[PDB]
Amino acid sequence: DLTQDEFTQLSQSIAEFHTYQLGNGRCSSLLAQRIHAPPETVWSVVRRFDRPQIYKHFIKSCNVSEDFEMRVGCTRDVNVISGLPANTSRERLDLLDDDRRVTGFSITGGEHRLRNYKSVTTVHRFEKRIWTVVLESYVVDVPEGNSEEDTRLFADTVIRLNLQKLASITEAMN
Numbered sequence: 001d002l003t004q005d006e007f008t009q010l011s012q013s014i015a016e017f018h019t020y021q022l023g024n025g026r027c028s029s030l031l032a033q034r035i036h037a038p039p040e041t042v043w044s045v046v047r048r049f050d051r052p053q054i055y056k057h058f059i060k061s062c063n064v065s066e067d068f069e070m071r072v073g074c075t076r077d078v079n080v081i082s083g084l085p086a087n088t089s090r091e092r093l094d095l096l097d098d099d100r101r102v103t104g105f106s107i108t109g110g111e112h113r114l115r116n117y118k119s120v121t122t123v124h125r126f127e128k129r130i131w132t133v134v135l136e137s138y139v140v141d142v143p144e145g146n147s148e149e150d151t152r153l154f155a156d157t158v159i160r161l162n163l164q165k166l167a168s169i170t171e172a173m174n
């Protein structure tokens with residue numbers, strides 16, 4: 001996946017936001033997407049907590065309060081497209097750092113099986129031409145009698161598809 005030069009450059013961010021030391025019954029993974037677009041452009045979409053459906057394929061709609069303010073602790077209600085093993089997710093914004101380009105959220109409830117899910121998404125400048133690397137990591141409980149391996153495959157597949165869609169949206173923005 002990540003090159004040596006990408007790792008090195010990305011080392012302290014990964015230690016700071018994307019490394020976990022967990023007990024059993026919980027699992028994590030880290031995923032990376034390269035985007036051939038300025039990190040200002042990528043971050044302008046990543047940080048828009050009220051409109052995840054701009055890049056998240058499986059989200060049919062997202063509702064926020066009439067008094068919504070973009071501030072740690074604000075919440076959103078997302079509704080999943082039809083036919084899926086989940087219908088809704090209730091999510092809380094945990095991080096919004098406009099200097100470092102760090103965001104994250106937690107799933108506090110809803111109709112789905114990704115209990116105590118929390119993810120962190122970070123945006124990184126690379127200079128070849130300016131490009132961007134996005135890291136996204138999550139921790140989640142392993143539902144009793146499911147395996148850690150199926151849980152990770154599920155989360156990873158959704159995050160990977162979302163970060164691909166992010167890359168296509170943000171590259172089209174040039």
Ligand SMILES: CC1=CC(=O)CC(C)(C)[C@@]1(O)/C=C/C(C)=C\C(=O)O
Binds near residue numbers: 113
């Ligand atoms: C597509 C989908 C299906 C589910 O079964 C769970 C949930 C409804 C939470 C989800 O929206 C999960 C989305 C997660 C993994 C990544 C995200 O959105 O950053």
